Structure formats: C-alpha cells, structure tokens
Amino acid sequence: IFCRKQAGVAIGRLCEKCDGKCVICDSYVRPCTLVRICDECNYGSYQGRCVICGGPGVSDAYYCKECTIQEKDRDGCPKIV
Amino acid sequence: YTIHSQLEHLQSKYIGTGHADTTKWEWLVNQHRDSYCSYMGHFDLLNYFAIAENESKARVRFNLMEKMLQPCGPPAD
Amino acid sequence: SKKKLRRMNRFTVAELKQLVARPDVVEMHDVTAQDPKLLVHLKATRNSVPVPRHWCFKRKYLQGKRGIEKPPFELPDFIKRTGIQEMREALQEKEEQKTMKSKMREKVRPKMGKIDIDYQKLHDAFFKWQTKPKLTIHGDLYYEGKEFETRLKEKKPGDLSDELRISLGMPVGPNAHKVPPPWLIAMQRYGPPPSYPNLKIPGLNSPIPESCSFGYHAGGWGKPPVDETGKPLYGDVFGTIDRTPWGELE
Amino acid sequence: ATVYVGGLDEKVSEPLLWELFLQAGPVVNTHMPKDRVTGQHQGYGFVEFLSEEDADYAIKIMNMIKLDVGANIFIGNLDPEIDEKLLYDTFSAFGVILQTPKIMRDPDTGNSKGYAFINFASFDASDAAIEAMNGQYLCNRPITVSYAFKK
Amino acid sequence: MGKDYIYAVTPLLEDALMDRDLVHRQTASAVVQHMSLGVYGFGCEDSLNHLLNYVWPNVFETSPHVIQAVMGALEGLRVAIGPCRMLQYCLQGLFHPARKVRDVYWKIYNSIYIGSQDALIAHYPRIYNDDKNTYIRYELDYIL
Amino acid sequence: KNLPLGWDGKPIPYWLYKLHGLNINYNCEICGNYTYRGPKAFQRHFAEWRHAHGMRCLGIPNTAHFANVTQIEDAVSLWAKLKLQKASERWQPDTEEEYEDSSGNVVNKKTYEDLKRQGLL
Amino acid sequence: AAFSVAVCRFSNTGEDWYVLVGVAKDLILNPRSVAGGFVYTYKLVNNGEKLEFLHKTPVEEVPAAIAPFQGRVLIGVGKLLRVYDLGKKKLLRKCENKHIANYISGIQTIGHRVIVSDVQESFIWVRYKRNENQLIIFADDTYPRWVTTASLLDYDTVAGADKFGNICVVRLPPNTNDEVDNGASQKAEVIMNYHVGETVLSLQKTTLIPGGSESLVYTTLSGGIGILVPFTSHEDHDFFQHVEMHLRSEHPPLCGRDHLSFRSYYFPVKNVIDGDLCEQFNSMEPNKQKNVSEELDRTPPEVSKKLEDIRTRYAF
Amino acid sequence: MFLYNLTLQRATGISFAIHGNFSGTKQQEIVVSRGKILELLRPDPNTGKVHTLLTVEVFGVIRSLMAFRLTGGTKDYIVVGSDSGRIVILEYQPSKNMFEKIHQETFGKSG
Ligand SMILES: [Zn+2]
Ligand SMILES: [Zn+2]
Ligand SMILES: [Zn+2]
C-alpha cells in the first residue's frame, strides 16, 4: 500500500533494522539520490520515522541507481501507511 | 483489488492508459492528443510544420491547440 | 438478448476474409472480437509479433515438456578451453568417495590450495576469445517443442554436408564441387522437379564445377543430359563497387 | 508425391534426408515414422515431394544413392566402382542382407574382375532383386544376378 | 561491466526459459531484468531481443511470483531495448477476442505507457480513417 | 456410445470428452462436404490432404490466404480479388515498359516490337 | 509546384545535358489531395547558363524525387518507382516497380544499386537487372523511420536522418544474395542510433580540412552544423567512452534531464559518443576536473589535449 | 562503426527570451534559448553591440522560460520548465561566468 500523495522537499529516514535497502527495489547498493516525502506523511509523530519499519529516523532512505535510471523515484511519498 | 482502487486511480492518474475493453476510439484519440502536445513541446517539429505550410509559429500552435479538442472525428456510438 | 444481437453482428470468416485487404491473418476466433477490422489491421501491420500459441490450450505452458528426458547444459567453448570442467569433475569424484568422518577431518584440517588454475587463462577466455553466440532476431518467440527441429528453409539444392557426402557415397571438401551427388545421377537420367524445378544440378543441369571430369566411370560427370538435337535437359549442363565501410575500427 | 524410402538407412538422418529432398525439388515432407520402441529408421519411409513429377525424377535420382538354406545370390558383370554400405543398401531394397556383398576380387592388386555374391534375407528376395536387375542398369558394367552357387 | 559476460550467459537463460519449472522461469526472468538494466546503453540489444522471444510467452501466467518476475523483466527490458520493440510485441493482443489476453496486454501497455509515454509518439502505427472520423495524422506526413 | 478412441482403443471418459469438445462438427465444403469433430483437428485439416485435393480441383492453390474459408463461392471471389492484386503488383513490361517510335509519338514495348518487326521500326 | 531536380545526360543522345524537374499540380496539405504531376525537362544551354523548355510529361502524382541512374533516370512518383528514358515528344517509361509502401521521398543510388527511402517505413534496397530489365526488392529495414534524407557510406551502408531528431546508420548484413528474384525477404541491421536533437535535413560524407580523414556532416533545421567522425583505435574509443561515462555521473545537465535518456529519446543509443558532453570537461571546475582525470589516471593536460586534438585532426 | 559527435556551429535560431538584471546591476541582460541551449547576451549601450557572454548546454528541451525577481532583491533568477519532470531555478555568476542551480523539484516523468 502506498501514500503517493505527491512529493516535496522533506527527506525521509531509516530505522537501523531497515538500514541500507532501497525503498522499493529492495537493493543494497549504489544509492544515488535522496528520498523526499509528502507533508501529510511528514507531520507530527511521523516526523523522522522509518518509511518501512516505522522505527526512528536515523539513516537516510536512498534510491537504488536502477530506480533512478527508470525514474521510479519521481512519484512522491511512497509510505506504506 | 485495493490494487484496483489504486489502479483505476492510475487510470485517473495517467490520461492515455487502457484496460481490456478500451475502444479503438479512445485509444487512437489519446495517441492523437499526445502527438499534439509533443509537436508543441519540441521546438523543432514546430519549425518543420511552420515551414511546410506557409504559416507562422503563432498560427501553427493556434491551429494545433484548436485541433486538440476533437482531433479524430466525433465519438464512437 | 443484446450480446446475441451483437452475435448476429458476429460476421462470417468469409465476411472477414473478403472484406480485409490482407487475408493471410484471419484466424478462427478473430470474429468474436469486439473490433475485428482493427484486430486484423493490427495483425497485418509490419514488424508486430503475434500472441503466443498457448492461450487456448488447457495445459499450462510447458507441462507438455513434462514427459521427456533432457541432457545437461553444454558450456561455451571458450570456457571449456580454459579447462575448468576437468578440475570440477575430479573434485566431484574425490568428495563423493570420501566418508563422513574424513569429511569432518578435512573440515578441521583443510587441504588448503589443493588445486590451481591460473589467471590470463580465464581473463583471456573472457576478454580475448569471447564470441557472439547464435541469436534470433525480432519476433521469433520460442514455443514448446520449437527446438524439436534444429534448422530449416534451405530449399537450395547445392546445400551439402560432409557427413552427408560420406553416408551418401559422395566426397567431402574441395571435391564437394567436382562431386556430383548420387541424386544428380538420376537428375541427369530422368530429371530435377515437375512443378518446383527452379533448382539446377551441378554437372547435370549446371556446368562443370571447377575442374570437373567428363566420363562414365566412378568419379566423373557423364553425359550432361541433352536432347537428341543437342540442347541440354535445362540451363547448360555442359557450360557455354568498393564495399569498404566508412566508420570502422583499426 | 508419396515416395517409399526403401533400404532406409538407420543413422542417415531425416534432416539431411529433407535437405536432399530440397536439393532435388519440393521438400514438403520427409518422414520415417519408426517403431514405437526403437527410434531408429524403419526400413521404409514416406517422402512427400508436393509435385508428382518432382518426386518421380527425384526418385530416379536418389535410387542407388549410397545411404542358412542358401539365401545367397550371385551377382556378376559386377560394378567395381561401388562401396560396401551403398551396395548393401541397393541389394537390401528387396530384403535384409545377412552378409554384405562379398566381391570376388583378385588378391594380387585389390581391383575386382566383376563378380560377387550376397546373402539376402529370402530366396524370393534374391529372386525379385535378381529379376529387377537381370541384365539391368548397373553402374558401369550392367548387372547380372541370380541364385548363387555353393563353394 | 556485464557487457562482457552477457554473451556467455544467454544460452543458459534460454536453456532455462524453455521449461524446467515455475521457479526455473521465475528466476531466469529476474536475471533478464538485471542484465537489461546493467547493459543499458552498450549496444547488446540483439541478445536481449533473443531473450525477449523466450520470456514473452510466459506472459499468460497465473502464479503471483512467476507473472510478477515476468513483468519486472519487461520493465527492465523496456528501458534497455527501447519502447518500439515492446509496443510491437504488445500490438496485436490489445483488441483480442478473449478477455484474459486483452487484460494482460493492457496491463503491459499501461506500464509501457506510464514510463516513456513520450517516445511512443513516433512509434504508433498507421490507423486508417473510416467515414465519420479522422484517424490518420497528416501532421506527420507533411513533406518538407 | 460413439466414444472416441484412445491410444489403447477404448472410450474416452466423459469429462475428458467434454474438454475436447468432440460434439462440435465443422462443415468443410471443400472436402467433399466432409465434416469434422475436434477443433484443432478441423484446423490442421486445412493443410491435410483432403483439403489440399479440394483446393487443386477447385482450381486454386492451397496457400494460406484461404484457409478457414470453407465455402467455394467465397473462395473463388476471394481468390478473384487476390488474382487481381497479384496481377496489379506484378510489373509487366508489356503494358508498362513503353517505347517512342522515331516519329515523336510513343507506344508500349509490345506494339513497338510488333510494328518494328512487321516491317517499319 | 516544383519539388525535385536532377541534371542528367541520357546516353542515347550525347553531352547535351537536360534538367529534369518534378512539378506537382494543385495540392492540398492537411487533407491530402493532388491534381497531378508534370516532368519539366530543360535543355540547359549556354554551356549551362540558361534553360530553354523542352516538354512537361503529365504523370500520376506529386513527383517528389528524381535520380540519374545508368544512362536513364529513376523517378519516384508516389507509390511507384518507375524508370524513364527519353524522347522529345514526352518521356517514356522503360521500367516500373509497384511495391513501395507509401510514398517515395528519396532515391539514392550507387553504381548499380538503389536505396529508395519512402516517407514512413524506411530505406528499401532495390535492384535493377538490366537484361531482364526488372526492378526487384531484396532487402529493407525492420523499423519505421520517417526519413528526411539519407546518404551512402559504402556499397552496403546507408546513413539516415529522421524528422524527429535522429540519425541512424543501417548496414546490410555482409552476405547479401544481391541477385535473386513480414513484408520482405531478408533485411538490414542498425549499427548506430543517435538523437541529435533537431531535425537533420542533410547528411553528407566528406572531409573538410586537407588530408583530414573522412566525416559525416549533418546540418539541422535550427542553424546547427556538425560532424560524426569514426574511431581508429579502441584506445581512443575506450578513452572517451570512460570520459563521458564518468561525466554523466558527476556533471549532469542543467535542465533536469538525464543525458543517456536524452540521447536515447526514441531508440536507444548505439555506438555514438557525445562529443559535446566530452568537450565540457574544459568548462568544468578544478575539483571535478581532478576527480575525473584521476579516475582516468591521466593528467587534466592529457585529457584536455586528447579532447582538443580529435577535433584537430577532423575539423576546426 | 564507432563514432564521435561534434558540433561546429551551435544552433543560432532563437525560441524564447527574457530580459532582466541577471547580474544584479541595472545593466540589463537577456537570456534566450536556442533549441537545447541556454545562451545569455548583454547589449552594450555604447556602440549598441550585444556580446554573447555565456552559451551553455542543457541536454533537454526548453519548453518554457521565465525570469523573476524576489520581492526586493537585486538579482534576476530564471525559472526553466523543460521536458524532464522537473522545474529548475537558475542564476548567473559573473565571477565564474556560469549558470548556477539553486533548487530542483521533480514532479513527474520525462519527455
Ligand atoms: Zn525501490
Ligand atoms: Zn502522504
Ligand atoms: Zn526500519
């Protein structure tokens, strides 16, 4: 399930369990570009969380270079809410 | 099927997609509109047409955007 | 019933075949399609690629491959050459003979570096002898049993093989020209094809292949088949620029 | 159209069979639908050349292509220019060959004087083959075949 | 740096795309996906064409993992091989009698369309105009 | 019970018979009003012999273009327009390849050689 | 409306040149419709310093292309590819071929081959067998390409422009059964694919500066002029290959785009390096100039000189 | 074949233009767009000769070009809408003679 309400300028973050993988491609490598999320899945208790685990925002969700070659990173906040 | 809520949201997201029942009319008219939006966007096919007919870029894009409304005949039934 | 009135719109396959501009396409179920004029124009477009066979079938994709026995995959030459396969066969036989106790004994006291295979053998295979396999161009979907027939559509007569020559009685090599095969003999005797014929036999309906020999023993060309007035059986059984590429690497 | 591939060779593959079918004319079908047990060639096959005269002349051409109660036949005026497998296949059109054609050639040289004897399957087989090739067209010296003598 | 071993590996993937099992074809399809995204732009498109021939038949499938890896292989293969080739694979089954085949082809063409909807403008066929509509694009065949 | 044969020559059981749908018969007029049970059977028949013969004697080759056209008047009108198109797209030098005489006026290849070799040109 | 021109001397006559002009009649453009074509021959007199009219043969269509070919002229008139020889009442047709898909906007012909180039499908290789006097197809392309002009690079290779931006080079496979008798028999392959960026309206195989190696000049529709230049050594090739493979990654375009995808807009790139991205190393920044030239482990001198000199030996 | 692509003469035709004080002064600069090119000229008032200061590649299509001034600042930013799914914000550095990317916002797909 996806948020997909369109993108913004607020970076996303990763818990430490979820540390390292891309958001969708589920890679572990060659991350190129930073993730951005929507205000609605940006506010409040959802500030600085794990887009996947829900855990605390510590490490930065990133985008596997394949995902940027196919521009699957131009859709917005992909938060599994 | 919540996948489908999202997927006809996708049909609502991308004007020009299809589904297994889509009609030759919707298909070809959507491709025709897209053709127009790109003749406008790409700065050079505009010169191609401007020069092919003896019109001028304002004339050209005005025609195009008028045609964008019923480009491929009237509707199906 | 409204589907049934559109079903009365559901025209005849001859209706289609006669309407259409390209009739090769028209198939069985084409007609129960909501827009057969489209469907057929599409299927008659250039370069397009038709649906697989097997949407009709009740059996799933290769459950029909189920039955047979199949031989293991065959490596590329340039990888056999580097002699990996024998290393691996040897290690296999070793470790299938060895017993559990000895297995764990080797776990605790390893045979470190039993073998070696040096580099530049590998790096030259992969970077100096790697070569284009056989590929199939746009369109030729693989369907079940397709490999069941190795190759075809060489309707040409001159196409001969060396095992063909050997197991037919004819010669292999530079003599595949000057060797008229045992079928050109009855080509000269009673003819080529009645409605096909567009093939001429070398030494029987074509001229002498390079340095052929006329004579009636084993190893010659015999009587080039001719009429009683002198005109051959067909053709002539006796016999009477700058293609440089512009951008190319040094 | 339909042609009997007789003396159908075991390993002589249907692929090159169809390639010769094409090198003669309309290669439309090459089939030797074999035993349901063996897989190898079953002695008679169907070769369809979709033109009748095509198959006729292709047959005239691909004939002779080199694919104990006395069932041995003497065959003289013999063609010295043959090979073993080709001669065996030609003899076997009317039966099996329980002994390939032993050519009574001189031993001084290795070149024959024109006689042989061949163990076929049946005496009626030697009859039919020796009849169809009595005086008939051998390679260079016309054939002359019949029941064989005993040595 | 797959532009080197793509040739070595193809005859093994074609081997395992001619059936061996569900999981066999699911996995060979994943391999095709990643090869295509690696070899984007280095010209090894004949090899990915060859493997399209073998992957595309699995299009009618049911198992979720299998059809899903197939669809992934076709997005990868879409960037690596271009969207003409794949629109041509997707042409004839858009308007098919059936509905299982209509639906799979419209699923694919949807994903081919979303990404790279703008190339296709030069890849669409020529679809003649009947009586009361206009369907040809005369814009594109002005001479000059 | 009319139950179709198996390899071991027995009835085929009923759910299987229904699957194979033998009940449905196809009137192939080309084949001597032969009529076929089994759909893919029907289809392969179009290249089977009886259809081949039918074609030959119809006066029209067994090329694919008519396969699944089973009525003979349809076949002949189909092959009629097909004939027309083949003759069209043929380039015939007789009517196309055209020759001016010396006199500043033009004819075709045929008429040029005609009056050429019957003593003027 | 005159749309095609060629100067030719038929060999039945001598060195009295004639200009041929295609002149269509009463056209409309967005419907399509025509009245008819006419073939204007002029005798090009005053040693070639004024034309005097000879004849205007009527013909079926807008006669959009004329080509001098082996003592006669090939003419595209819409769907027809007809071979013409000369009279002074009219123009007489010695051959016809009728299989071209839509509309023949180009004819370019080597000593005895023809590369017709229709308006939508492709280049289509056509053969003239003189003794039977036939015009017969043997090899065409596998794509649609709305061509605007093509060029010959050899006996088997043809370069094409395209209305949407692209240039491509298409080559016949090396083994073509030239003489014989979906919709084709055997086809050609594509060996390069480049999205120039603007409509390319004329290619030409040429060398500019004296003794400079050969080249392709392309001249677009927006005031752009350029060249595509071969490589002689996998050392050069691999060099710039890596140069730009890094340049994309660390110095992307300004306007949001990706360079790989912009140059593979319609059909993917194949065997063309972006000299105009490479030549940007100069205007880059010392930090990045370092970083990349150190990946190459050459000095920014080595790179920049190897950049400049490759234009030096081809162009200016 | 293996080819190298070089442009001798840039595209000259003009499609879009804006005028603004793109160097902060009250000497005005003009930013025009060729096809896939952003070129900046400054017209000298003395002779009346326009010097083409900065000619840059952008590898895209400029579909839309509009300058803007912040409420009270002395600079003249550029907003470029091109054929990627992004809006981009540009500025001039005369110190380096180079266009500078302030911000960057994706909103969709390419082409
Ligand atoms: Zn991801
Ligand atoms: Zn949200
Ligand atoms: Zn987490």
Swiss-Prot record, chain B:
Q: Which residues carry this modification: Phosphoserine?
A: 5
Q: Which family does it belong to?
A: Belongs to the SF3B5 family.
**Pfam families, sorted:** SF3b10
| PANTHER family listed in its UniProt record | SPLICING FACTOR 3B SUBUNIT 5
Top-level taxon in the UniProt lineage: Eukaryota
The gene for this chain is: SF3B5
The UniProt subunit note reads as follows: Component of the 17S U2 SnRNP complex, a ribonucleoprotein complex that contains small nuclear RNA (snRNA) U2 and a number of specific proteins. Part of the SF3B subcomplex of the 17S U2 SnRNP complex. SF3B associates with the splicing subcomplex SF3A and a 12S RNA unit to form the U2 small nuclear ribonucleoproteins complex (U2 snRNP). Within the SF3B subcomplex, interacts directly with SF3B1 (via HEAT domain) and SF3B3. Component of the minor spliceosome, which splices U12-type introns.
Protein name, as recorded: Splicing factor 3B subunit 5
| Annotated positions for site Interaction with RNA | 1, 16
**Where on the chain is N6-acetyllysine found, per UniProt?**
13
Curated annotation (Swiss-Prot), chain C:
Where in the cell is the protein located? Nucleus; Nucleus speckle
Q: List the disulfide bonds.
A: none
Residue numbers carrying Symmetric dimethylarginine: 59
Q: Tell me the keywords, alphabetical order.
A: Acetylation, Coiled coil, Disease variant, Host-virus interaction, Isopeptide bond, Methylation, mRNA processing, mRNA splicing, Nucleus, Phosphoprotein, Spliceosome, Ubl conjugation
Q: Where is the major localization of this protein?
A: nucleus
Q: Which residues carry this modification: Omega-N-methylarginine?
A: 59, 66
What changing residue 59 to K does, per the record, is: Abolishes interaction with SMN1; Abolishes methylation by PRMT9. Abolishes formation of omega-N monomethylarginine and formation of symmetrical dimethylarginine
User: Oligomeric state and partners?
Assistant: Component of the 17S U2 SnRNP complex, a ribonucleoprotein complex that contains small nuclear RNA (snRNA) U2 and a number of specific proteins. Part of the SF3B subcomplex of the 17S U2 SnRNP complex. SF3B associates with the splicing subcomplex SF3A and a 12S RNA unit to form the U2 small nuclear ribonucleoproteins complex (U2 snRNP). Within the SF3B complex, interacts directly with SF3B4. Found in a complex with PRMT9, SF3B2 and SF3B4. Interacts (Arg-508-methylated form) with SMN1 (via Tudor domain). Interacts with RBM7. Interacts with ERCC6. Component of the minor spliceosome. (Microbial infection) Interacts with HIV-1 Vpr.
UniProt name for this protein = Splicing factor 3B subunit 2
From Swiss-Prot, chain E:
HEAT repeat positions: 3-41
Could you describe the subunit structure of this protein? Component of the 17S U2 SnRNP complex, a ribonucleoprotein complex that contains small nuclear RNA (snRNA) U2 and a number of specific proteins. Part of the SF3B subcomplex of the 17S U2 SnRNP complex. SF3B associates with the splicing subcomplex SF3A and a 12S RNA unit to form the U2 small nuclear ribonucleoproteins complex (U2 snRNP). Within the SF3B complex, interacts directly (via HEAT domain) with SF3B3, SF3B5, SF3B6 and (via HEAT domain) with PHF5A. The SF3B subcomplex interacts with U2AF2. Identified in the spliceosome C complex.
- The protein's name: Splicing factor 3B subunit 1
Q: What's this chain's function?
A: Component of the 17S U2 SnRNP complex of the spliceosome, a large ribonucleoprotein complex that removes introns from transcribed pre-mRNAs. The 17S U2 SnRNP complex (1) directly participates in early spliceosome assembly and (2) mediates recognition of the intron branch site during pre-mRNA splicing by promoting the selection of the pre-mRNA branch-site adenosine, the nucleophile for the first step of splicing.
Site feature location: Interaction with SF3B3: 45
Location of the region described as Interaction with SF3B3 and SF3B5 in the Swiss-Prot/TrEMBL record: 88-144
Q: Where in the cell is it found?
A: Nucleus; Nucleus speckle
* Family per similarity comment: Belongs to the SF3B1 family.
Q: What does the entry report about post-translational modification of this chain?
A: Phosphorylated. Phosphorylation occurs concomitantly with the splicing catalytic steps.
Curated annotation (Swiss-Prot), chain H:
Annotated localization: Nucleus
Cite the record's note on assembly.
Component of the 17S U2 SnRNP complex, a ribonucleoprotein complex that contains small nuclear RNA (snRNA) U2 and a number of specific proteins. Part of the SF3B subcomplex of the 17S U2 SnRNP complex. SF3B associates with the splicing subcomplex SF3A and a 12S RNA unit to form the U2 small nuclear ribonucleoproteins complex (U2 snRNP). Within the SF3B subcomplex, interacts directly with SF3B1 (via HEAT domain), SF3B5 and PHF5A. Identified in the spliceosome A complex; remains associated with the spliceosome throughout the splicing process. Component of the spliceosome B complex.
Instruction: Please state which protein family the record places this protein in.
Output: Belongs to the RSE1 family.
Q: What is known of its domains?
A: The core of the protein consists of three beta-propeller domains.
What is the recorded function of this protein according to its Swiss-Prot or TrEMBL entry?
A: Component of the 17S U2 SnRNP complex of the spliceosome, a large ribonucleoprotein complex that removes introns from transcribed pre-mRNAs. The 17S U2 SnRNP complex (1) directly participates in early spliceosome assembly and (2) mediates recognition of the intron branch site during pre-mRNA splicing by promoting the selection of the pre-mRNA branch-site adenosine, the nucleophile for the first step of splicing.
Q: What is this protein called?
A: Splicing factor 3B subunit 3
Q: Which organism is it from?
A: Homo sapiens (Human)
Q: What is the name of the gene encoding this protein?
A: SF3B3
What part of the entire protein does this chain span? 1 to 111 of 1217
